Amino acid sequence: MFENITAAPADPILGLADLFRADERPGKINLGIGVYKDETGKTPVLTSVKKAEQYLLENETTKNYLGIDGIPEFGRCTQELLFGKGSALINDKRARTAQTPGGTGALRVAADFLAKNTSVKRVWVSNPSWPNHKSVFNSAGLEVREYAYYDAENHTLDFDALINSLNEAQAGDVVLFHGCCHNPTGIDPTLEQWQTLAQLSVEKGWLPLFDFAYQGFARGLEEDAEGLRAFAAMHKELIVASSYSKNFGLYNERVGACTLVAADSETVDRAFSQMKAAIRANYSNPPAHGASVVATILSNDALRAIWEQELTDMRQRIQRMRQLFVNTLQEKGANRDFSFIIKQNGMFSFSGLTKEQVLRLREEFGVYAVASGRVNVAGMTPDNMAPLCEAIVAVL
Amino acid sequence: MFENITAAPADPILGLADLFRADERPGKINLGIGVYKDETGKTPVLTSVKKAEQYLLENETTKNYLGIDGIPEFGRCTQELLFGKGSALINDKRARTAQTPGGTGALRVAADFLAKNTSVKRVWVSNPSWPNHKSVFNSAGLEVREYAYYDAENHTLDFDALINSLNEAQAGDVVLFHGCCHNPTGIDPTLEQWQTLAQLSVEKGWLPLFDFAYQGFARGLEEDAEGLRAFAAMHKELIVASSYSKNFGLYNERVGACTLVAADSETVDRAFSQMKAAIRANYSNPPAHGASVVATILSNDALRAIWEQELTDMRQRIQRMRQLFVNTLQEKGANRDFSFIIKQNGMFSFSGLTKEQVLRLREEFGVYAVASGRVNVAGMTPDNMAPLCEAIVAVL
Ligand SMILES: Cc1ncc(COP(=O)(O)O)c(CN[C@@](C)(CCC(=O)O)C(=O)O)c1O
Ligand SMILES: Cc1ncc(COP(=O)(O)O)c(CN[C@@](C)(CCC(=O)O)C(=O)O)c1O
């Protein structure tokens, strides 16, 4: 029976990592997967995380199953981070949160939930977007449509085309938005643009679904949540899939959350019971460790202060590398203007290189980037910057 | 969009956990969820596990993403446990293993893998069986069929009814088998019966799917795999979803595995690529903490020896409670023979109690059991045995 199965292509992102770990030539540079790296080029575990883990090792007395929706405090801390400490959504108990295995897991439970319990048939995603978005929703049998987003000429948000392309999104359709640090463009809407979309969203009857995987990597925790909060004060219902993989450096512990928001407490609890049914038929209940670490840190004022400082340092090192990248490209003789890179948010910048050049950089200079031209700026260091820019210039 | 969602019914297993937690009676007894308890009534963290976690805390340098299929060593160690150190499936490289979030997760990925890449239409499940089996397969869009298994009169396995029931399973159909410690009956096939089923399976043309969540709780590690090893030596293709939740006491860390077996190395790798795709669209990659603990314990002989002794103590304490249970029931006035309980394997015992009785035990005496009459013997201790048996006799 397994003879008739046709092989699957390699993940355009996770695959690259294997092709890199395979390359034998010295000096290789990995600018693929969106994982943070410090000045020495390593992905260390945060100090606040090592501390939390020591606390858990000493105080855990059992590994007994968590409830289907995970750790209670985890859900509470998540909601404050997203909506704000005094939020009315929280005070009116209009939101329920389930701890999930990563942001991906949050996206999948939301998709399964929507497919099995609502009349949702279509999800609208930006073009371009994280490749895995279409796969997650299709996995639940949901049709995925794309809306315009990037002005590749001015390296900015094509707001006019975005509005026009979403004209066909009907009431009941789900529209996916990146909370901040759009992947892979790094271009986010301004608060004014968010407000416009929020209004348009309510009038058209869309079900907003926010993917929040980089909160704190744009400007700050609270600032990066402004777009979501503009919608939240405007809508009756919405879904938010968030991830702690990057802002806590907990990639492999799979820590995320799927937050459901309904018109009132009675409706959300009812709907949430069906979300739990969906989780139960998938992985039963969430992994404890990653989420325990996060709940511990967010709950302890002393630990939280350290974490917030570590997040700030990562954010600043990236912005620092953004400026150094543009300066070195000039220094090394680039005639093309890359100034636009300074205006992008997060780990990824859309370089504007053609799939051809991207392959030439790899098989010829040993530099790895995603075929879309997306480069992980957080992977750049003072030590590989020069060879990197020298490679790019040579392929321009 | 959420106004008309109908509330979902509570899980017949995980639901009780919340009821029990809420009950105010100081003398409540929990015999519901299949979780091990020591003589003190606690669900401790194994010593082998605690030591392994100390190693990790001390030596982990990064939390960087694992890889769709997880830790390689983990995959190698579970195949040896399942097939045997010098198995032909291993040497001939016919097997691929993906690390999954618990056995439940392993079941869902296998289900998704099958529904999206093959012609499989329905899955055959024992009657009775773990309630979640139907939910997991129906969620992936697969039709579920039940085959006879338990003789409620003689409290034994009705091999005649089992074989006659399965004669209706067409080729290409999937048939689910519990590796050992059948849930909820506790009655497993003899090697001879396994021998037959294996032969009948190849001839009938079924795709065997083994659920192995209790290896080591029946007779022993190697011994409990006999049934599986019998099918392995005969079939070209098979799937095994295993769990480390119980034999390692790592319930909430979600540690499981899904092993794919094909005719040759080329076919399995081709098929496994789609399984990785199914995973990527679900939770992307697996949680590292639990799987890491298992890998290091199974890899270190000094640690391994400790773990194996701990598993033996757990298996033996359960056996001692099983005997104590039957003896105490007669002493407290049981007007019936519960000897059949001694013949059951695993953590449970199919008591024979009706739903109305189980219902009465909870509300009238605060003794919690599953509505099917399934009782967790691993939850019985020398201290709660008396009150527990008195309650049962009273509703008899
Ligand atoms: C928009 C976006 N949404 C959801 C996720 C899911 O994150 P999770 O917590 O790992 O499940 C990621 C991770 N993006 C990478 C940084 C990680 C690798 C990947 O593709 O999953 C990236 O390279 O894009 C995203 O960029
Ligand atoms: C046959 C069987 N299969 C799969 C699983 C899944 O295990 P996982 O690794 O936790 O995903 C369980 C756990 N059964 C319980 C011991 C746990 C509660 C539950 O229903 O999941 C039980 O009480 O049956 C099983 O009994």
From Swiss-Prot, chains A, B:
Its EC number is 2.6.1.1. Keywords: Aminotransferase, Cytoplasm, Pyridoxal phosphate, Transferase. The keyword Cytoplasm applies. One of its GO terms (biological process) is L-phenylalanine biosynthetic process. Pfam families: Aminotran_1_2. InterPro entries: Aminotransferase_I/II_large, Asp_trans, NHTrfase_class1_PyrdxlP-BS, PyrdxlP-dep_Trfase, PyrdxlP-dep_Trfase_major, PyrdxlP-dep_Trfase_small. Changing residue 374 to A: Reduces first-order rate constant about 10000-fold. Induction: Transcription is increased specifically in response to 2,4,6-trinitrotoluene (TNT) and its indicator compounds 1,3-DNB, 2,4-DNT, and 2,6-DNT. Has been used to construct a 2,4,6-trinitrotoluene (TNT) biosensor strain. The keyword Flavoprotein does not apply. One of its GO terms (cellular component) is cytosol. The modification N6-(pyridoxal phosphate)lysine is found at residue 246. It comes from the Bacteria. GO terms for molecular function: identical protein binding; L-aspartate:2-oxoglutarate aminotransferase activity; L-tyrosine-2-oxoglutarate transaminase activity; protein homodimerization activity; pyridoxal phosphate binding. Its cofactor is pyridoxal 5'-phosphate. It is found in: Cytoplasm. Its main location: cytoplasm. L-aspartate binds at residues 34, 130, 183, 374. It catalyses: L-aspartate + 2-oxoglutarate = oxaloacetate + L-glutamate. Homodimer. Belongs to the class-I pyridoxal-phosphate-dependent aminotransferase family. This is Aspartate aminotransferase. It comes from Escherichia coli (strain K12).
